Amino acid sequence: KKILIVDDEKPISDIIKFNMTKEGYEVVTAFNGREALEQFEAEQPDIIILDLIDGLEVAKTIRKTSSVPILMLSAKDSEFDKVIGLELGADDYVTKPFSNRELQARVKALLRRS
Amino acid sequence: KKILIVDDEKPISDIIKFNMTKEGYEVVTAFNGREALEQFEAEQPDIIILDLIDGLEVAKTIRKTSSVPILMLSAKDSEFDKVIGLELGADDYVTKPFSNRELQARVKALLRRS
């Protein structure tokens, strides 16, 4: 399975890439909205981890063409934030800082379900 | 032409209904998200004035089936607010308090354009 990680901070991208690789996924990365949409089109990931082009707008664009699972990750943890991510098409929304095991379990649940 | 005004505050609804009637539109009203979606389906308005079911979610639902012009109105005036209204499908976004003539001019521009 192939995961696209969309994160503008290289430290957190590396941690998630490390942990997903350790589980046996193939990982592609993108560091802005433009690279995210290019990578999504060119790589056809099975799942996108897509921090908050602007994260809400990426997920909006993707859902125009694709039902690929999207897991949003964000330091923003208010009800407004979670609800709007989910309404714009996220399948799940996880806050930073996150537990590495929990993120892995949530990626697996999403993959199982699609 | 028929305008659907979606406003949960009866005082402001009445002012907008008054002014739109004075110009010769037929006005239907709705006071929550559920009534908005029912009225949109049953009345097929030519334009919706749709204050911020939750305004962003209404406009999202509408755009699933329809390209009817939507003018969002809101006391929230930050960049985030305007941008997200527009990205979720609004054609225009006007802040409260508004000028009655300006709202009329913006409804006309929208109608002209669709």
B84 touches chain A (CB under 8 A): yes
Are A5 and A13 contacting, i.e. CB atoms less than 8 angstroms apart?
yes
Q: In whole angstroms, how far apart are CA A29 and each of A97, A100, B111?
A: 19, 18, 44
DSSP-derived 3-state class of residue A49: strand
What are A29's strand-pairing partners?
A5
Query: Determined by which method?
Result: X-ray
C-alpha distance from B20 to closest chain A C-alpha (Å)? 32
Q: Which helix (H) or strand (E) holds B28?
A: strand B26-30
Cα-based angle B54, B49, B20 (whole degrees, multiple of 5): 145
Q: Is B23 helix (H, G, I), strand (E, B) or coil?
A: helix
Q: Is B87 on the interface with A (CB under 8 A)?
A: yes
- Rounded to 5 degrees, φ, ψ at A28 are -115, 150
The CA distance from B66 to B53, in Å, is 18
Taking CA atoms, A8 is separated from A13, A21, A35, A82, in Å, by: 8, 19, 10, 20
> Where are the extended beta strands (E) located within A1-114?
2-6, 26-30, 47-50, 70-74, 92-95
**A87/B contact by beta carbon, under 8 A:** yes
Bridge partner residues of A30 (DSSP)? A6
Please give the helix or strand (H or E) that residue B77 lies within, else none.
Answer: none
**Integer Cα distance of B68 and B62 in angstroms:** 8
Substitution target in A53, A56, A62, A86 with the highest count of B β-carbons within 10 Å is: A56
B28 touches chain A (CB under 8 A): no
- Note the CATH architecture for domain B1-114: 3-Layer(aba) Sandwich (3.40)
- For B75-105, give one letter per residue: b (16+ CB within 10 A) or e: eeeeeebbebbeebbbbbbbeeebeeeebbe
Residue A79 contacts B where some CB pair is shorter than 8 Å: no
Rounded to a whole number of angstroms, the distance from the CA of A81 to the nearest CA of chain B is 12
Residue B74: which H helix or E strand, with range?
strand B70-74
Residue A74 bridge partners (DSSP): A95
Contact B5, B16 (CB under 8 A): yes
Contacts of A35 (CB under 8 A, 6+ apart): A6
Q: List, as ranges, residues 37-66 from B with C-beta within 8 Å of A.
A: 56-57, 60
Scan for tokens 């012009």, then name that residue: B69
A81 is in an annotated binding site: no
Total residues belonging to chain B: 114
User: Tell me, what DSSP letter sits at residue B6?
Assistant: E
Q: Which residues in chain B have their CB less than 8 angstroms from residue A57's CB? A: 87
How far CA A45 is from CA of A30, A37, A85, B12, B86, in Å, comes to 12, 11, 20, 48, 28
Could you give the CA distance from residue B36 to residue B48 in angstroms, rounded to a whole number? 9
